[PDB]
mmCIF file of C-alpha atoms in Angstrom:
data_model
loop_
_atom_site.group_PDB
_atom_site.id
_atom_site.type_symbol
_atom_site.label_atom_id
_atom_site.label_comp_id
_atom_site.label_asym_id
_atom_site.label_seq_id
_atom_site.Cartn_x
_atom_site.Cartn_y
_atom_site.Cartn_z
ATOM 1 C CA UNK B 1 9.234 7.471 -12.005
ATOM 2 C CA UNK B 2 11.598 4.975 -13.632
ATOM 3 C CA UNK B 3 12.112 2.005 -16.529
ATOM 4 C CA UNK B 4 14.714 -1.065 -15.474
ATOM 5 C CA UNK B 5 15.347 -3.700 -17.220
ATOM 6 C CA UNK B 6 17.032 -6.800 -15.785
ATOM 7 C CA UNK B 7 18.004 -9.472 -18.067
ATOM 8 C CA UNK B 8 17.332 -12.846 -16.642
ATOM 9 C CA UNK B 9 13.863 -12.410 -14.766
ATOM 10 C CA UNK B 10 14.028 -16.284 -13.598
ATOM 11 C CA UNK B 11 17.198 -15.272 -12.139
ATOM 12 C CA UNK B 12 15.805 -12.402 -10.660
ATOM 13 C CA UNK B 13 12.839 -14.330 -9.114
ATOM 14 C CA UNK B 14 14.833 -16.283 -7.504
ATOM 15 C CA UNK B 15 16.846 -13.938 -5.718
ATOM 16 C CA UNK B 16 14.035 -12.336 -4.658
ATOM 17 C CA UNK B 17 12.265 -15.348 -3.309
ATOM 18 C CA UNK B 18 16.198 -16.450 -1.474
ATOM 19 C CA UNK B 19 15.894 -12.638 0.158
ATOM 20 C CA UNK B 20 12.549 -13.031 1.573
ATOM 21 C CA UNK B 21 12.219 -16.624 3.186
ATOM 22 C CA UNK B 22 12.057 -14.619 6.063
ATOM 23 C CA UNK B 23 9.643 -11.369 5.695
ATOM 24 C CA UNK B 24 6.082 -10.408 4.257
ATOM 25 C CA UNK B 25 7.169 -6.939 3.239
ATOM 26 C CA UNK B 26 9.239 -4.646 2.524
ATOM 27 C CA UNK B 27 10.217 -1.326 1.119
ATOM 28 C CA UNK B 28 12.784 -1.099 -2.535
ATOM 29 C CA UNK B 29 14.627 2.215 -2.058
ATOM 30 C CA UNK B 30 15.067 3.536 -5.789
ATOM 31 C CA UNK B 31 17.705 5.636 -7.007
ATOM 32 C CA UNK B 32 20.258 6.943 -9.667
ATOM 33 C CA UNK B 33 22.883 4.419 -8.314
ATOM 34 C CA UNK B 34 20.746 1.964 -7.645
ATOM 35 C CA UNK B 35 18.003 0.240 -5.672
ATOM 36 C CA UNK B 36 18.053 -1.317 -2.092
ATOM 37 C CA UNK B 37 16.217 -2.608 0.852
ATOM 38 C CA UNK B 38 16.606 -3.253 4.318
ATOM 39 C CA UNK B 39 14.352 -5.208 6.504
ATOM 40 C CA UNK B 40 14.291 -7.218 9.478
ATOM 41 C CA UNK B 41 12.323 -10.571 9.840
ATOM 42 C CA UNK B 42 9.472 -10.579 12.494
ATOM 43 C CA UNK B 43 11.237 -11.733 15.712
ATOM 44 C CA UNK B 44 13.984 -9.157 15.366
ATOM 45 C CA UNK B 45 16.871 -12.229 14.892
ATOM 46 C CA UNK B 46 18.328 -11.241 11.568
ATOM 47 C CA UNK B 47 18.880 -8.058 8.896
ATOM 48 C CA UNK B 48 18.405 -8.674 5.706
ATOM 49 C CA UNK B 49 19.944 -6.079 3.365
ATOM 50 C CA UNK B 50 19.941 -6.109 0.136
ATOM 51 C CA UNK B 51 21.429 -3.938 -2.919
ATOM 52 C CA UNK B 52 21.829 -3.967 -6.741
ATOM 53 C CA UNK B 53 23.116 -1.416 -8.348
ATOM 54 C CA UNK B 54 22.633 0.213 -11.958
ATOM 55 C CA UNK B 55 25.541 -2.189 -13.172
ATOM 56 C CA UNK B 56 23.307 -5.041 -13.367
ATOM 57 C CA UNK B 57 20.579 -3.761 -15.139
ATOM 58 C CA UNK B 58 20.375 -3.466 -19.102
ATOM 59 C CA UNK B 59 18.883 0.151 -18.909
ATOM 60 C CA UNK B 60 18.497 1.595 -15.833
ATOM 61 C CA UNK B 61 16.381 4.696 -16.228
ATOM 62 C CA UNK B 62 15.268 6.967 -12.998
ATOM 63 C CA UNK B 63 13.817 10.335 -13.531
ATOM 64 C CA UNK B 64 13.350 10.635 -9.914
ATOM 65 C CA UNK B 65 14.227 9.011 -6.651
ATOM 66 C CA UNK B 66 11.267 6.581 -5.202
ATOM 67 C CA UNK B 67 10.329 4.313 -2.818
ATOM 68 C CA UNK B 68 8.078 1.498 -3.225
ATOM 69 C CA UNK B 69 6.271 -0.597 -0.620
ATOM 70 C CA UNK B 70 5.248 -3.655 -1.637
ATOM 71 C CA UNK B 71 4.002 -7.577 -0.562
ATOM 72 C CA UNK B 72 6.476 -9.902 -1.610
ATOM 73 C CA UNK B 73 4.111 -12.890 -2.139
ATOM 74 C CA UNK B 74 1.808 -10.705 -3.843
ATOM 75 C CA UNK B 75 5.345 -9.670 -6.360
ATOM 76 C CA UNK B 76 6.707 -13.341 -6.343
ATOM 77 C CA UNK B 77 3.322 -14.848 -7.918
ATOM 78 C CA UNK B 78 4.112 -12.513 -10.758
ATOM 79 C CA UNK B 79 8.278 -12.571 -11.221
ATOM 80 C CA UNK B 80 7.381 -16.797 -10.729
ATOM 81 C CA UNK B 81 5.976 -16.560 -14.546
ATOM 82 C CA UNK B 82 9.536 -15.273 -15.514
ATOM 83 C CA UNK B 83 11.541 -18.061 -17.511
ATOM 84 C CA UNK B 84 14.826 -18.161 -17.779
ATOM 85 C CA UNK B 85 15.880 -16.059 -20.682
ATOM 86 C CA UNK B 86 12.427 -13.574 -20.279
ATOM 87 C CA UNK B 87 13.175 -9.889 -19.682
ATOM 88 C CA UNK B 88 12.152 -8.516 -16.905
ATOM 89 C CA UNK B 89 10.459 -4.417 -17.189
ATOM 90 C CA UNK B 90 10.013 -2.560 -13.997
ATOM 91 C CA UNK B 91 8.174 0.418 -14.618
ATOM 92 C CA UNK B 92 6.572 3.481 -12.275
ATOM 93 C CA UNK B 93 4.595 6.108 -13.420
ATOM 94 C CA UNK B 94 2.446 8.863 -11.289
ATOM 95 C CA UNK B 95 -0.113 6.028 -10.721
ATOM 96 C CA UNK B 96 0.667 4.409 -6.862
ATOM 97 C CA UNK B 97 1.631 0.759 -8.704
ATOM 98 C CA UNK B 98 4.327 -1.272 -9.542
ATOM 99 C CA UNK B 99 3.901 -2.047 -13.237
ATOM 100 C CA UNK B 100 5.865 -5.181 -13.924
ATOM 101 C CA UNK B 101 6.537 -6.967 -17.936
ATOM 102 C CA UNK B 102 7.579 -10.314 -18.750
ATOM 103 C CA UNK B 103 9.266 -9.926 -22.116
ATOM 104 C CA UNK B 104 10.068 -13.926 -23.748
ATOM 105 C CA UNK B 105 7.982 -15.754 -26.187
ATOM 106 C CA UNK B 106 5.140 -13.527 -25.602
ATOM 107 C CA UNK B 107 4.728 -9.996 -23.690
ATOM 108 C CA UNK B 108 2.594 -9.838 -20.311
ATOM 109 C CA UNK B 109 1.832 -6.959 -18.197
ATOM 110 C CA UNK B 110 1.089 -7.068 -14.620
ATOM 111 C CA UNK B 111 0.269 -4.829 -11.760
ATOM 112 C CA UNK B 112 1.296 -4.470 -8.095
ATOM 113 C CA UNK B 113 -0.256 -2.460 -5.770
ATOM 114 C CA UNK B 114 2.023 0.057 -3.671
ATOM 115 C CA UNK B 115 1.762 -0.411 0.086
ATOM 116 C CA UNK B 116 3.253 1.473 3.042
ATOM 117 C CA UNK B 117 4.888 -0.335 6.277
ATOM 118 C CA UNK B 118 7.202 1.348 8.038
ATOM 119 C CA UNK B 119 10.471 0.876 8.303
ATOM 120 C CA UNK B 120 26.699 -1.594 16.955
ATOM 121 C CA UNK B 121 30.443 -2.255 15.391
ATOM 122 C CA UNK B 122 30.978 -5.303 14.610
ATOM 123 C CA UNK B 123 34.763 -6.152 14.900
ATOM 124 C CA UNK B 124 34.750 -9.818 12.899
ATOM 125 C CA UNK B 125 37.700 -11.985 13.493
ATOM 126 C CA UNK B 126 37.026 -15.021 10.721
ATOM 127 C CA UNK B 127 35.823 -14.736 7.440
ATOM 128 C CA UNK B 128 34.943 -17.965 5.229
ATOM 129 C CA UNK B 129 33.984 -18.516 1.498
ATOM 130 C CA UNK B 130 31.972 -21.882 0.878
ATOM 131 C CA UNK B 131 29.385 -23.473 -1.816
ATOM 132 C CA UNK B 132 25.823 -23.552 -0.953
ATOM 133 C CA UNK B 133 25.880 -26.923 -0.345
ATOM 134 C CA UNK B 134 27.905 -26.713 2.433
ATOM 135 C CA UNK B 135 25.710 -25.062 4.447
ATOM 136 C CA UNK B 136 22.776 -26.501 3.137
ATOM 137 C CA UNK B 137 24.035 -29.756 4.200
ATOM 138 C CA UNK B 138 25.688 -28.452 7.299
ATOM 139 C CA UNK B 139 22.259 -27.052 8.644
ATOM 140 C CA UNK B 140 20.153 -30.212 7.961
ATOM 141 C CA UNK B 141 22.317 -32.811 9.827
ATOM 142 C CA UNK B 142 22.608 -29.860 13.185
ATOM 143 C CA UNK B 143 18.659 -29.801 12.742
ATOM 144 C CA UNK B 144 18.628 -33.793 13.314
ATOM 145 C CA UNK B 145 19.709 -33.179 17.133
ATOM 146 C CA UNK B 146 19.729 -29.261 18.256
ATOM 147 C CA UNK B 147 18.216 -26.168 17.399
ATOM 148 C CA UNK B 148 21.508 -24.525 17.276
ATOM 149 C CA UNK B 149 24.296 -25.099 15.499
ATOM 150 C CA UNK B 150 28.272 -24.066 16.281
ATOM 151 C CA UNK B 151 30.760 -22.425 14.185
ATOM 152 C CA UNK B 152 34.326 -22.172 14.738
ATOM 153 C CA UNK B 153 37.231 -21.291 12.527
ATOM 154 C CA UNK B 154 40.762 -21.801 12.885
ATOM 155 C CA UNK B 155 43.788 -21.396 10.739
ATOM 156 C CA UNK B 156 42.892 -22.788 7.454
ATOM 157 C CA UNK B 157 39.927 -24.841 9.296
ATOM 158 C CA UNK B 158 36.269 -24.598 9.486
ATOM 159 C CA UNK B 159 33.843 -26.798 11.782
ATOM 160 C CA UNK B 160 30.109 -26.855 12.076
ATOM 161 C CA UNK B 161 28.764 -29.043 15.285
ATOM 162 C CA UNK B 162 25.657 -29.367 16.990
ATOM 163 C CA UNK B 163 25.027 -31.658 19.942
ATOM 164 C CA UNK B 164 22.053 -32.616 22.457
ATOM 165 C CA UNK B 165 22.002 -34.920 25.926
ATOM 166 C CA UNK B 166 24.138 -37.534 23.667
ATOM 167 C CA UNK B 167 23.753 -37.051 19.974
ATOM 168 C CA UNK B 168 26.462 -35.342 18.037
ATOM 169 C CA UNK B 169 26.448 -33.826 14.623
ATOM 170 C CA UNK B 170 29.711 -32.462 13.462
ATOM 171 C CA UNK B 171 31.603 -31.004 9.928
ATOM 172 C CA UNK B 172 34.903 -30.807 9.824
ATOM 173 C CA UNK B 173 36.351 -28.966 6.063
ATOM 174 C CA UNK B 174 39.657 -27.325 5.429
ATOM 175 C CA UNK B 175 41.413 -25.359 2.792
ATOM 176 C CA UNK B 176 44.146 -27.948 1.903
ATOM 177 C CA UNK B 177 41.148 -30.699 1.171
ATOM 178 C CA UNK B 178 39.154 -28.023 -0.780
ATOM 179 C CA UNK B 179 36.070 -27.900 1.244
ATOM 180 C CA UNK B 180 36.186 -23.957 1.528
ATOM 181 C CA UNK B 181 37.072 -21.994 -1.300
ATOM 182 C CA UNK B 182 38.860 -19.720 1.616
ATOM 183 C CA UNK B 183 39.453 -18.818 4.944
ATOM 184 C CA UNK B 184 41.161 -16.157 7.155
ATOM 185 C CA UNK B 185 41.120 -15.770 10.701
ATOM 186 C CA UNK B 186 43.017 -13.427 13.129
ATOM 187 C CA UNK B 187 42.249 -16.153 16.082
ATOM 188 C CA UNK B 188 40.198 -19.166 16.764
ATOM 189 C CA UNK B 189 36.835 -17.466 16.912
ATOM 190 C CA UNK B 190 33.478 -19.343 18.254
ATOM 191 C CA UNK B 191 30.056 -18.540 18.392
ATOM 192 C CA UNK B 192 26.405 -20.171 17.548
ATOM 193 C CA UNK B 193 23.089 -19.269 15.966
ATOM 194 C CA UNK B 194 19.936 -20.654 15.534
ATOM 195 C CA UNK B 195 19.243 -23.611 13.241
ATOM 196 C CA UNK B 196 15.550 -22.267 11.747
ATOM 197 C CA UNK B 197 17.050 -18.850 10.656
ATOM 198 C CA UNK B 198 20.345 -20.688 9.060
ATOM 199 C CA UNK B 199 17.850 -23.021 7.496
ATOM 200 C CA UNK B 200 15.807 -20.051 5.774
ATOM 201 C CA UNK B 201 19.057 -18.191 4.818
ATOM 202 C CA UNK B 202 20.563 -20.822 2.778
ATOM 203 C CA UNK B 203 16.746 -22.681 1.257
ATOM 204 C CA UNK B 204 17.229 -20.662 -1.581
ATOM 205 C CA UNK B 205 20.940 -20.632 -2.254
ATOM 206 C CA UNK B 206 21.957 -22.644 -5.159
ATOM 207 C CA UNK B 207 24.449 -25.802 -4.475
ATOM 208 C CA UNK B 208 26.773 -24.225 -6.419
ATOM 209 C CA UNK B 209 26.533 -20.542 -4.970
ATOM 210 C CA UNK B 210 29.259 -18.856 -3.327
ATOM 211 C CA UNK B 211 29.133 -17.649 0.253
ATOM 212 C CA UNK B 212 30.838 -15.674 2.474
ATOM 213 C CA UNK B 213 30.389 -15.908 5.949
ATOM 214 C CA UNK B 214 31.854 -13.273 8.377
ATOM 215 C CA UNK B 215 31.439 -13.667 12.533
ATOM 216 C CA UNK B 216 33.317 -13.258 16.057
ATOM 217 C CA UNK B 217 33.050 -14.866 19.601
ATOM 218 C CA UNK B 218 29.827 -14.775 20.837
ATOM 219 C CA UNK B 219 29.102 -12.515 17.871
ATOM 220 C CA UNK B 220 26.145 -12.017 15.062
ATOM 221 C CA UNK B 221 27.167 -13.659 11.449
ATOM 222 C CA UNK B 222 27.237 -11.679 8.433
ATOM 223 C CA UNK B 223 26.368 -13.670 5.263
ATOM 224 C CA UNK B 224 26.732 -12.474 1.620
ATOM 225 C CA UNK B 225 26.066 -13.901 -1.888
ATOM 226 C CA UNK B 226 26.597 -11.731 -4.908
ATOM 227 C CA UNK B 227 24.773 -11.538 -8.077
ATOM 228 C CA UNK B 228 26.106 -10.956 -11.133
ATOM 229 C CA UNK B 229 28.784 -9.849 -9.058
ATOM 230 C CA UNK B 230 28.253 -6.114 -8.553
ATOM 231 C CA UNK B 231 24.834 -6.796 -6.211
ATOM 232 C CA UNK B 232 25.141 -8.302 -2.757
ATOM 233 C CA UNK B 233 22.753 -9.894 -0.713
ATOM 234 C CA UNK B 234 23.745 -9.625 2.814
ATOM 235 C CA UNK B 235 22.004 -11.216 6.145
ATOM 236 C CA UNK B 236 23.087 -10.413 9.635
ATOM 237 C CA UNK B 237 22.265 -13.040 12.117
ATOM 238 C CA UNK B 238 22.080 -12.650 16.103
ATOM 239 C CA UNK B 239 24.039 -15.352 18.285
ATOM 240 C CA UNK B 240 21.809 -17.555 20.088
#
């Protein structure tokens, strides 16, 4: 059983709907320090891991350990009624349900029905911070000619291209113009991934988000965004 209590639940619904573009289900890991999940998406492409920890939450109460399956659309049609100042109160009992409040103008109680579903080193040699936009942008023009899109990263330069039989998309940003936030590579490092999984990773990012993007030659991506900074929400992408 537990009580948390997140301040923000519009901010909270969103994250939840940005981690789950990708899967149906999944199960929230509950403990003293924290809570977490880890899933992968249907077609076994990408990781999605996330974890926010007792930091974030205005009381953060767990008598013991728990975890808790659950349908994300099912939860999303309910944390969707959050507004942005609301409090948000998750609360388990004995009883096998999710009890969730909306605390704002005017106190509703909801219910969500507990389900089951079951549940290599990766030596990175570039690492870059960008806005949202960037990628959002970035992913929409590759999408107009290939269903892949290129990354490479050189000293204190970051490019994005994506090409067919004879159409060309490419994004060329650098540190010095301001287009990343930052960048640090050992050596030039290149690899590609698929547009459609990009494209659900970054839908819910906000234009003004922060990323971090971590990858290698020939090598899966690791993408993070952080929430009120102590919780991470971290993808792990295949190459293509």
């Amino acid at each position: 059983p537990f009580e948390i209590v997140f301040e923000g639940a519009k901010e909270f619904a969103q994250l939840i709907d940005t981690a789950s573009k990708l899967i149906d289900e999944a199960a929230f890991k509950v403990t003293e320090d924290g809570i977490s999940m880890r899933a992968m998406d249907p077609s076994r492409v990408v990781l999605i891991d996330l974890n926010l920890p007792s930091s974030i939450f205005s009381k953060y109460e767990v008598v013991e350990p728990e975890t808790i399956g659950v349908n994300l659309d099912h939860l999303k049609k309910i944390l969707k009624r959050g507004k942005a100042k609301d409090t948000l109160i998750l609360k388990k009992g004995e009883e096998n349900f999710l009890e969730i409040t909306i605390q704002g103008t005017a106190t509703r109680t909801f219910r969500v029905p507990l389900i089951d579903v079951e549940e290599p080193e990766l030596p990175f040699t570039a690492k870059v911070v960008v806005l949202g936009e960037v990628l959002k942008a970035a992913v929409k023009a590759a999408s107009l000619v290939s269903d892949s899109i290129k990354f490479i990263a050189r000293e204190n330069e970051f490019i994005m291209k994506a090409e067919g039989e004879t159409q060309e998309v490419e994004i060329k940003l650098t540190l010095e113009d301001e287009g990343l936030l930052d960048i640090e590579v050992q050596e030039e490092t290149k690899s590609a991934y698929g547009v459609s999984y990009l494209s659900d990773m970054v839908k819910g990012l906000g234009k003004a988000d922060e990323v971090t993007i971590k990858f290698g030659n020939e090598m899966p991506m690791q993408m993070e965004y952080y929430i009120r900074d102590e919780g991470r929400l971290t993808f792990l992408l295949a190459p293509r």
